[PDB]
Amino acid sequence: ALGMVETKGLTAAIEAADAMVDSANVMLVGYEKIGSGLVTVIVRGDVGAVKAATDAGAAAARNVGEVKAVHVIPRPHTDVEKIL
Amino acid sequence: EALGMVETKGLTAAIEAADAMVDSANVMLVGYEKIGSGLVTVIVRGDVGAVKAATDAGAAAARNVGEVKAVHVIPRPHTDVEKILP
Amino acid sequence: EALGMVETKGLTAAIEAADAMVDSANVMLVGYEKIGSGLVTVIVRGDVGAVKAATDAGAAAARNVGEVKAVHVIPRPHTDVEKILP
Amino acid sequence: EALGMVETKGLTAAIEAADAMVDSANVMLVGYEKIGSGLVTVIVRGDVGAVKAATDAGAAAARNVGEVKAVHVIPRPHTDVEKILP
Amino acid sequence: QEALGMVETKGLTAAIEAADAMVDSANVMLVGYEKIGSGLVTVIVRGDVGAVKAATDAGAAAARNVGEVKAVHVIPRPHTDVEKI
Amino acid sequence: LGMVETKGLTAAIEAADAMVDSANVMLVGYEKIGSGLVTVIVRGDVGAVKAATDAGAAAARNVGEVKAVHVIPR
C-alpha cells in the first residue's frame, strides 16, 4: 500500500513523517518537492498500517502547517510502482 | 499511439490520476513531469478510445484528492513529440 | 533559418503547442525548457517561413488548451542556429 | 535527541536564526533545506529543553530580518526522519 | 577581455531574444542563462568593455519588445572573487 | 559575516562586486532559494563587513531590489 501526506512547508512535512513512523509499521520512502512550497511525504507498508500512518501524519501536520492532501492507494498498479 | 495528459496542482492528486488511468483502461503510463508552482503532469499512451476513457477516469479520481488544472488527448501525435515525453 | 518559441504556463498547453508546430510545418522540435513557476518554453527550428507557420499554429493550439505567455520567432544564421540556446 | 525547525521566507532570516540558535543553547546545527519559493528550513538537534530555547531565540531573531513561516520541535524523533533531513 | 554584461528578463523567450541581439551586436561570448525563480532569467555575456556595453544595450532594447526587462548592467573589470560565481 | 539579499541576480552580482571592491572582505557565499531571491555573503573583520554591506546594498539598489542587508558578528 502507498500513503501520501502533502503539506505547505517542509516543517509540517517533517512532523507528518515522524508521526507516521511513530503511529504504525510503515517505511518512510522520502519526500518530493513540487513548488509553491508544497512537499509530499511518502510511506509504504500494509494497508491497515498505511491508513493508520496517514491519518496520524495528517492530524499532526495540521498543527504545524496547512495539509493539502492525504491519500492512500491500497494496491497501486505496477506501472505506477515503476514511476514512484 | 494516442497521448493523454492530466495536469494537477499537487503530486498526491497526480499519483491518484496515474493509478486511476492505468486501472481504468488499456493504457501505458509514460511518466510524470514537474514544472514548478505545484504543477504535475501525468502522461499515458494507448489507442484513442482507451486514452479518452483513461483521462476522463484520471481527472475524476484526481478531483476527489486535489485540484485538476488540465486534461487533454492528442489522438494522433507526431513522432517528434515522443522526444519530449517522460 | 529561424528559432521559434512558444512559452506557456502548464505543460499540457506546451505539449499541445509542440505537436501542433510539427504537424503544421516542416520544422524540427528542439525540445522544451523549464524555468520554474509552471513556465515552459517549446523551441522549434527550420526555414523562416516554416517557423512562422509553425509558431502561429502552436500558439493557437496552446491558447485552445491553456495560457500562452509569449510567442516569438528569431531569425538565425543557417550555420549556427542553436548557438544562443541554453 | 530532539529536533528543532525554524522555517523562513528569505535566506538572510534563516542564517540569523541559525546564529541565534547555536548561540542561545547547547544545540548542534543539522543544516538548511530549501524547498523553492524563497522558503528555507533551519534544523538543530539537542536535548529537548535546549532545543525549545534555541528555536524560540531563532524565530524571534528571524522575524526582525524576514518572515517566519513555521517553528516546531519534535522531542523524540525516530531515526527514520534522517532520511529527509539536509 | 573581461567585462561582464547582464540582461535579466521575466520569461525565457525575452532572454533568448536578448542573447541573439547581444551576440549579433558585438564581439561578445555568451556565458549562459541563470534561472532564479519568479520566472526571472539572466543572460550573461563576456567581452571587452566596448563590446559588452554595446551588446547589453542591444539585448535590453531587443528583450523589451518581446517581454519585460528587469535589470541591465555592465561591470568593466569584475573582482576575482566574483569570477568564482 | 555580512549578507546582502536581492530580488534578481544582476543586483546580487553588483552587490558582491561592490562589497569586495569597497573593503577588506572575501566573498564566501552565493545562494539561490527561489522566488527570485539571491544572497551574497562575505567574511572579514566586523568593520570591513559593516562597510562592505553598506557599499553592496547601495550599489545593488541602483540596479535592482534589495530585500535584506545584515551583519552577524561572530
Numbering used by the authors:
A (entry chain F): 5 to 88
B (entry chain D), C (entry chain E), D (entry chain B): 4 to 89
E (entry chain A): 3 to 87
F (entry chain C): 6 to 79
Sentences from the paper on this structure:
The lysine 26 mutant is the most important to study structurally because Lys-26 is conserved in all shell proteins and contributes significantly to the interface between 2-fold related hexamers in the native crystals. There is clear electron density for residues 4–89 in nine copies of the PduA subunit across the two crystal forms, and the C-terminal residues, including the additional 23 residues, are not seen in the electron density maps. In both crystal forms, the regularity of the tiling is lost in that the K26D PduA hexamer no longer has strict 6-fold symmetry, and the separation between hexamers is greater than in native PduA sheets (67.2 Å). It is perhaps not surprising then that no structures are seen for the K26D mutant in the bacterial cytoplasm when PduA K26D is overexpressed. For one of these mutants (K26D), crystals were obtained, and these crystals reveal more fragile hexamer-hexamer tiling than in native PduA in one crystal form (type II) and only one-dimensional tiling in the other (type I). The mutation K26D has a profound influence on the conformation of the neighboring Arg-79, such that this region of the protein no longer adopts a single conformation in the crystal, resulting in breaking of the 6-fold symmetry axis of the hexamer.
It is one of the more abundant components of the shell and intriguingly can form nanotubule-like structures when expressed on its own in the cytoplasm of Escherichia coli. The majority of shell proteins consist of a single BMC domain (Pfam 00936) in each subunit and assemble into hexamers.
